[PDB]
A paper describes a structure:
[name] ([name]) is an ubiquitous enzyme expressed in all somatic cells that plays a central role in glycolysis where it provides energy in form of ATP through the reversible phosphotransfer reaction from 1,3-bisphosphoglycerate (1,3-BPG) to MgADP in order to produce 3-phosphoglycerate (3-PG) and MgATP in the presence of free magnesium. [name] is a monomeric enzyme of 417 amino acids formed by two distinct α-helical domains of equal size, the N- and C-terminal domains connected by a hinge region. The N-terminal domain binds 3-PG or 1,3-BPG while the C-terminal domain binds MgADP or MgATP.
Residue 189 is part of the 189–201 α-helix, the structural element that represents the hinge connecting the N-terminal 3-PG binding domain and the C-terminal ADP binding domain. Another form, defined as open and that is the most populated conformation in solution, has been detected through small-angle X-ray scattering. Interestingly, in the M189I structure in the closed conformation MgF3- is not present, therefore the transition complex, evident in the wild type structure, is not formed in the M189I variant.
Residue numbers in the entry: 2 to 416
The structure:
Amino acid sequence: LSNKLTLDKLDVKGKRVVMRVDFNVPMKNNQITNNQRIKAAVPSIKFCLDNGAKSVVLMSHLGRPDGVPMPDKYSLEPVAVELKSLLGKDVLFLKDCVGPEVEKACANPAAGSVILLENLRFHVEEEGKGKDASGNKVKAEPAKIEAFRASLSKLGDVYVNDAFGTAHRAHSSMVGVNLPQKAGGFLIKKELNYFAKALESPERPFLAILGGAKVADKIQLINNMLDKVNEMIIGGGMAFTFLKVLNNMEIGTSLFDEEGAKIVKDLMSKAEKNGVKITLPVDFVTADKFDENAKTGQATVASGIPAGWMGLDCGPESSKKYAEAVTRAKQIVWNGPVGVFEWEAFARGTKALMDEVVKATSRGCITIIGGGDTATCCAKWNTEDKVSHVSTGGGASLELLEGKVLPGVDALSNI
Ligand SMILES: Nc1ncnc2c1ncn2[C@@H]1O[C@H](COP(=O)(O)OP(=O)(O)O)[C@@H](O)[C@H]1O
Ligand SMILES: [Mg+2]
């Protein structure tokens, strides 16, 4: 960022600001479970308003609608409502993010107008791909992508990107906006500065804790991370891929990444060569279906998971092994709950791991927890202030740990 235009050097007096934020907040039945990512953008938004912005037009994705409109499942409308509360200002919600009606509402707003656009991923051109409404994979057309970007660019005179949590995504709203000044917000500044200091020479041992459910994405990041860390917990939804390939463990209907499976053995060889201690769980809480009211069971690696059942949390021997890796660390980066922590039957391991990480912070371990869902763990159990840093970035944070530049940063104007 030292090299890039940032919002503190952007003259906004009388300008419309179009601002990409990560408002991809966790939900249960169109209710916001954690407004952390919303609050995190407020400093950038208030700056613009305080310094005389004509308008701030906010844009984000929510979940993975795959390029089809899904207002019933994936609308940002609840986020506009929560934003109102957080800003003390009213927020005009629009039901689309591009096209003539949107351009019109954004062309010349009343001074101080805050506008939140609908889910960008209701359009295929944001990601550059998705699925048609029948579930068949489609790829977007370049001339349509270009038009999508041109339409977004009409909505502001100047562009800010404060979407740290999405900064690893080279999507239209993140790298494609064509305006003369493209400036990083304060949340991006705050996050890049923390990780720059913490990644420069990590305290050792440096433990990465990888869990969660986006197994196809995350498994592809392990290879570079193995040059940076001394230990790695591979837990949550990611473990099953590894145990299937390594132990031939019967995993039931647990998450499994078919492509990921093909590099597991390569990753474990690299880990052995780099002296990275891999800790996989050894036991599970199982469920007879993917429901919070499912019947619960126990499984071990040796027993396997029964057919039709899925592992949704680690068990007590796993928690103990996770605790011992946490006890040995001087620095930790954790992204991905180690169970379906949202559901109380499957929350105990993630809760146990959190208690250990809080303890560790107390004896001077540098502890970093990131992700839309992993940070919600901290909100759930009131630990946001009992670890060293809660980041709004999960996958974005792991890509920094890999040593990469984030495209959403790299696309900003130079100083
Ligand atoms: N064994 C599992 N099977 C399915 N989902 C899991 C498992 N363990 C954790 N999860 C889920 O992982 C999700 C979070 O994954 P992810 O989005 O990758 O993390 P973050 O948002 O912190 O980057 C949670 O919603 C949680 O329910
Ligand atoms: Mg997530």
